[PDB]
Design a protein around this ligand. Structure first.
Ligand SMILES: COc1cccc(-c2cc(F)ccc2[C@H]2Cc3nc(N)nc(C)c3C(=O)N2)n1
Length: 207
């Protein structure tokens, strides 16, 4: 298990998300579904010039899986996935610029729901989760588990768990007061409200 420091700017963003009073927490789901959709668009387009990129799985979809026993909501996609370099180097580079812009927008009167416009919507997971675990597999790289409970550090390890083919699984370990996001009716309401035109099947699993 390797432990890494977030860039100061990203730690600052995470603290803002965790600490700011903001009741409209439900937007985390739209942000993660949007990320999944982008990842699916990316593998689909790449496969037009290299069909072998789908050898790791042809089906392009999103699953939402609540588990009341574990108190987790998992968002699974069969998108492009992330390499180790993405997790430790590349995504932090884009996150730095997006965070700066988002901060400027907030000072000028924007609100937290607009986070996705700045390309850093992933961190909205921390509106509802005390810990986020991400399992990811990109073609030609290993399966990794990324994890963070904020506090300025994240971990990465090679994942020896259930092989996933290709894609990303975001596992939200929900805060004690955010268990509404495990309820079928609530998730259905939110998907209908904010994610109705996503161009991939979204299957809401039941418990
Ligand atoms: C999903 O897990 C993680 C872990 C660390 C950082 C990010 C991240 C951060 C950003 F600022 C902007 C974008 C991302 C991710 C968001 C993402 N989600 C999904 N489902 N799939 C992919 C390929 C990505 C991706 O390419 N980038 N995402």
């Amino acid at each position: 298990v390797e432990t890494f420091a977030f860039q100061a700017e990203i730690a600052q963003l995470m603290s803002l998300i965790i600490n700011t009073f903001y009741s409209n927490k439900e937007i985390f789901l739209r942000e993660l579904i949007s990320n999944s959709s982008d990842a699916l668009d990316k593998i689909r387009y790449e496969s037009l010039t290299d069909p072998s990129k789908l050898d790791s799985g042809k089906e392009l979809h999103i699953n939402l899986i609540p588990n009341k026993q574990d108190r987790t909501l998992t968002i699974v996609d069969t998108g492009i996935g992330m390499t180790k370099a993405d997790l430790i180097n590349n995504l932090g580079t884009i996150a730095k610029s997006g965070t700066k812009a988002f901060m400027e927008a907030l000072q000028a009167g924007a609100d937290i729901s607009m986070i996705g416009q700045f390309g850093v919507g992933f961190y909205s997971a921390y509106l509802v989760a005390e810990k986020v675990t991400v399992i990811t597999k990109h073609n030609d790289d290993e399966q990794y588990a990324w994890e963070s409970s904020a506090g300025g550090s994240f971990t990465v390890r090679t994942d020896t768990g259930e092989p996933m083919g290709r894609g990303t699984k975001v596992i939200l370990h929900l805060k004690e007061d955010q268990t509404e996001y495990l309820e079928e009716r609530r998730i259905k309401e939110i998907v209908k409200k904010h994610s109705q035109f996503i161009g991939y099947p979204i299957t809401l699993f039941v418990e």
